[PDB]
Amino acid sequence: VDQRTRDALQRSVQLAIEITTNSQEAAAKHEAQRLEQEARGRLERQKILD
Amino acid sequence: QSEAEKARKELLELEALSMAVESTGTAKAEAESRAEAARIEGEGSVLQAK
Numbered sequence: 001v002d003q004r005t006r007d008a009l010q011r012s013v014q015l016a017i018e019i020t021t022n023s024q025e026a027a028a029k030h031e032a033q034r035l036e037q038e039a040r041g042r043l044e045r046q047k048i049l050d
Numbered sequence: 051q052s053e054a055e056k057a058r059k060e061l062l063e064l065e066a067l068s069m070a071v072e073s074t075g076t077a078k079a080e081a082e083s084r085a086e087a088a089r090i091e092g093e094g095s096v097l098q099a100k
Contacts, residue, residue, distance in 0.1 A: 041053065041054070044054050045053050045054055045057055048054060048057040048058050048061055049057055
């Protein structure tokens with residue numbers, strides 16, 4: 001019945017959306033770091049072979 | 051780092067061989083030049099003595 005209550009719940013749903021976007025950005029950052037380290041390791045082994 | 055050390059072992063073996071070659075070549079060259087000069091001086095000293 002109270003409008004303030006519904007307005008308070010809108011902040012809850014926008015915080016849930018912000019949480020989901022932060023989660024996908026963190027997953028992308030960790031995949032980027034894994035590929036970066038794999039390429040760096042292959043590059044170092046190739047420099048020693050050269 | 052484990053894979054890089056696996057190849058770095060063979061790199062260090064080849065560098066050990068190259069250092070061996072360089073050091074023994076330098077020492078052999080200098081010693082043989084001094085021995086040749088000494089032999090020529092010795093035969094000259096024989097002829098001077100006569």
